[PDB]
């Protein structure tokens, strides 16, 4: 293994964080623990709906969860019922008075997490992995991103030896530190094992 995390190398310049707050040297670990509890809870619950990102933000002794999702219909459902049903239990998990903001994403076949869970769920319901990859690749290209590179890996539907496929198209420079490279990965649980999916999507270079 060689490469760098392409989100972590751009955590400073172009990509923002996923948990922005401040602590002393005394409550830093407990902030991390309650953050990770609400992250695992939110992912496990609204995994049927397609979340994309979670901005955990705790301004001044109250928590705030901004859920970037694509389909708000399974997040909300009826007239603001399940969102408060989630909000009281986020307050229950973190122990703090709470807030939940729920935001949409436009073009839900362009972010890095959504394409990855699409290929993941298709591989769980047992489609051809080449059809899954090539479908997602040409969907992102006709949606108009500059680049996409997808890569599935391991136990590819009927093998004992585990090869690693990747397709690129467009242009997607990774050693550029000023690009906008949405990277994310995911795991498919099949009875052939764990099939790993990674996807880079280059949206556009950003200037100073």
């Amino acid at each position: 293994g060689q490469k760098v995390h392409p989100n972590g190398i751009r955590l400073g310049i172009v990509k923002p964080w996923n948990s922005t707050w401040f602590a002393n040297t005394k409550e830093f670990a407990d902030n991390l623990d309650s953050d990770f509890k609400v992250r695992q809870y939110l992912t496990k619950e609204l995994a049927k709906a397609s979340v994309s990102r979670i901005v955990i933000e705790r301004p001044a002794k109250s928590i705030r969860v901004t859920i970037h999702t694509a389909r708000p219909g399974i997040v909300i459902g009826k007239k603001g019922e399940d969102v408060e049903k989630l909000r009281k239990v986020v307050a229950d998990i973190a122990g703090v008075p709470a807030q939940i903001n729920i935001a949409e994403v436009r073009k839900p076949e362009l972010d890095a997490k959504l394409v990855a869970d699409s290929i993941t769920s298709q591989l769980e319901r047992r489609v051809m992995f080449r059809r899954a990859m090539k479908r997602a690749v040409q969907n992102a290209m006709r949606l108009g991103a500059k680049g996409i590179k997808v890569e599935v890996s391991g136990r590819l539907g009927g093998a004992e030896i585990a090869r690693t496929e990747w397709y690129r198209e467009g242009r997607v420079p990774l050693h550029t530190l000023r690009a906008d490279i949405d990277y994310n990965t995911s795991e498919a649980h099949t009875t052939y094992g764990v099939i790993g999916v990674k996807v880079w999507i280059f949206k556009g270079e950003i200037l100073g």
Partner: protein, 99 residues
């Protein structure tokens, strides 16, 4: 005087937050000294990155706490209620003390 000491993680956000507090305090009170900077606390960490065995494979990370100090020398009766009313931005900690 009430001294204001603002600690944060992002220098853009801390500049915007001290800008909003200095203009809100300037609108009401008188004799704000200035948003001075203090030494940025550069906490550092070294992690082995291999899960089993490589001593020669390491990353090093920093948490760069930026820290500003804004002084208010002549508070009126209501600037202290203005700042205790003022909800400050998400990701900036503040400490205020008269004396």
């Amino acid at each position: 005087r009430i001294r204001i000491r603002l600690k944060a993680f992002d220098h853009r956000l801390i500049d915007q937050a001290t800008a909003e507090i200095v203009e809100t305090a300037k609108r009401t009170g008188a004799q704000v000294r200035g948003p001075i900077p203090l030494p940025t606390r550069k906490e550092r960490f070294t992690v082995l990155i291999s899960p089993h065995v490589n001593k020669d494979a390491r990353d090093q990370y920093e948490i760069r706490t930026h820290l500003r100090l804004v002084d208010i020398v002549e508070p009126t009766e209501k600037t202290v209620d203005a700042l205790m009313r003022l909800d400050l931005a998400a990701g900036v900690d503040v400490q205020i003390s008269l004396g």
